[PDB]
């Protein structure tokens, strides 16, 4: 199977809902694992760019590739060990890093597809139509959905607007690009970034590469830029069946600020991002990473410096724990643009029954 247990850093007295560590350096691997999965795992382990949306697409692509490479054996049938393989892959993924609802949905869809086609049809003809179908699905629930979202944004966003964004959600970046080049509008895009992740920075860079006026913002200096700000979009990850946004980093604070100061908050989301599972706080299900990211002085990601920090077990009780994903409130984000055009966050799972 690989490597299990034996990890640095304590279990911690505060916040221990999920397991904290997993394979990063490859040693003794099974002689049946597809390299693309391994590469993906390697990437995710230390990624800066992707967040929720592109990850799922990547996964889908990988799956497609696997299917293309797969052929029906003489002894075992098409539906004999494929499911087992999928399960193994899932387990590997989980071991690497906790997964999203979209991925789960995709898995479910795949499972359904497996059941649908009966093991009697010609093998070459089977996968030919399968990969086409999967492509079609991808086009529909992602690209077309993105387009729909863009169009929704278009009718709502006024002439000459100031937008404040967080994270590295691809859809928002696409929207901003559209605003810049295709429609041609006056845009002021303020992007906020945190210590361990340089997603905001990346977004800013991307904007620059197009030709947009960008203000770089931080958590320490928030109130100075608001007091002027008209419209705020948040980096969406998943909407729960209560009306709460399970999202990345200090978006909740921003939302609170928005609520305090005049204008309501807006959220752009996909039709398949919705979850039937329910939770109402950050303590419920936390996504964790290694405290090794916050040791060095900032500036850039790879530095390797000698200074003062570099003790987790050496000094007299030192805990340096952080959270990657937090909870955003219910009443504060009201706007939701999805595959079913219009709706609010109070409307929690009306689209879930409609599918």
């Amino acid at each position: 199977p690989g490597i299990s247990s034996v990890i640095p850093t304590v279990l911690e007295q505060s916040f221990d809902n999920s397991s904290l560590i997993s394979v990063k350096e490859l040693l003794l691997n099974k002689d049946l694992i597809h390299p693309s999965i391994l590469l993906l795992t390697s990437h995710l382990a230390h990624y800066k760019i992707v967040g929720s949306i592109p990850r799922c697409i990547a996964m889908l692509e990988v799956f497609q590739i696997v299917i293309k490479d797969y052929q029906t054996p003489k002894g075992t049938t098409l539906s004999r060990n494929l499911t087992s393989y999928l399960s193994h892959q899932i387990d590997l993924l989980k071991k690497a890093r906790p997964l999203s609802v979209t991925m789960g949905n995709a898995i479910r869809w795949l499972k359904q597809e497996i059941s649908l086609i009966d093991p009697s049809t010609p093998d070459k003809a089977a996968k030919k139509d399968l990969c086409e179908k999967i492509g079609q699905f991808a086009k529909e629930k992602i690209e077309l959905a993105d387009q729909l979202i863009i169009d929704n944004a278009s009718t709502q966003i006024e002439e000459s607007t100031t937008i404040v964004t967080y994270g590295s959600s691809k859809v928002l970046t696409e929207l901003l690009l559209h605003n810049a080049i295709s429609l041609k509008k006056n845009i002021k895009v303020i992007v906020v970034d945190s210590r361990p992740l340089f997603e905001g920075r990346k977004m800013a860079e991307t904007l620059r590469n197009a030709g947009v006026n960008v203000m770089y913002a931080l958590i320490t200096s928030l109130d100075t830029i608001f007091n002027d700000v008209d419209y705020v979009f948040l980096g969406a990850h998943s909407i729960l069946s209560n009306g709460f946004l399970y999202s990345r980093a200090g978006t909740a604070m921003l939302a609170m600020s928005a609520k305090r100061r005049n204008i309501p908050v807006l959220v752009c989301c996909e039709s398949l991002k919705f979850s039937q599972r329910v939770q109402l706080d950050s303590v419920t299900f936390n996504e964790l990473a290694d405290p090794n990211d916050l040791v060095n002085i900032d500036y850039e990601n790879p530095v390797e410096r000698r200074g003062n920090k570099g003790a987790l077990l050496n000094q007299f009780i030192k805990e340096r724990k952080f959270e990657k994903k937090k909870l955003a409130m219910e009443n504060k984000p009201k706007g939701n643009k999805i595959g079913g055009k219009k709706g609010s966050e109070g409307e929690s799972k009306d689209a879930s029954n409609e599918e």
Binding site: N242, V278, Q279, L280, E330
Partner: protein
Amino acid sequence: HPNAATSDVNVTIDTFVAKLKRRQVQGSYAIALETLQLLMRFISAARWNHVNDLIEQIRDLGNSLEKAHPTAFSCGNVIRRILAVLRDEVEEDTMSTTVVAEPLISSMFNLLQKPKTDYRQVAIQGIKDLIDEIKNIDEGIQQIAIDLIHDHEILLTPTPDSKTVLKFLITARERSNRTFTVLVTEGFPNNTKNAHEFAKKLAQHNIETLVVPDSAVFALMSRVGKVIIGTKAVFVNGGTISSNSGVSSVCECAREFRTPVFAVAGLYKLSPLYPFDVEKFVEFGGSQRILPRMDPRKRLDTVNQITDYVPPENIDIYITNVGGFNPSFIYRIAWDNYKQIDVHL
């Protein structure tokens, strides 16, 4: 409609009425069971020939029952559910008798535009299904319920009168990895003995129990993590009728401190009728239990009530056997169980 038609065919109606009036029957579940039994009796014995007429008769009976007792919501609800069950089957039948498109499961424009079988067995089966549903609620809650409470968190419990809430608590407490401190509000004129019993049970279960008087809620509120209601009846917009005394104030306090307010009840307690008035549905208790003597107590007019009504603004979560729901969503659940015409009888 009087009881002239039902005298030798069905006699148990009078007994049911008696049970309702003098409070011989206790606990909403029991009432529901009784109602189910009555329905079964009606079905097995009576004659129909026509279907619409039968439906009308059923409606009339329901109305009569309501008139006999308004605080028995479960009774009403069960009847409504049965009617709904009947109705769909009837609709299906009509389509075959005659020999349609819809965007969703139900359509609004179908009301504006102009639209013998073995249904008895189906009706019988419906009752059985309802009974089964009534039987187990806690098994469909615990998979969602034991995910919210965490280590070193403090719970606050108004209304320990409900049998479901205690069970829910117990299930959470079972887990060895989970540890929590329990603060229990008493409720003086209606809930005291029950509260004491609850406390005793908690002690037996080997959990840290804190018995708190009704005045000492404010001082401990800086440490309070979650709020759970022992409600008796659920409604359309979100508002709930709680199982007697000391719920409203606590809820208000929670709202003030922005403490999360949970609610555990079930869909058989859920009603498709609106609580337009607090005064109409909420029944009041007894003056004798509070203070002794009678001649000076003519001057001392004491006010005491059984049931309590809490606005939907304070409560946010309604976990049932199906899953976790909101006050902004529960209406749809009711619709999925009780049909459009079945609301007014």
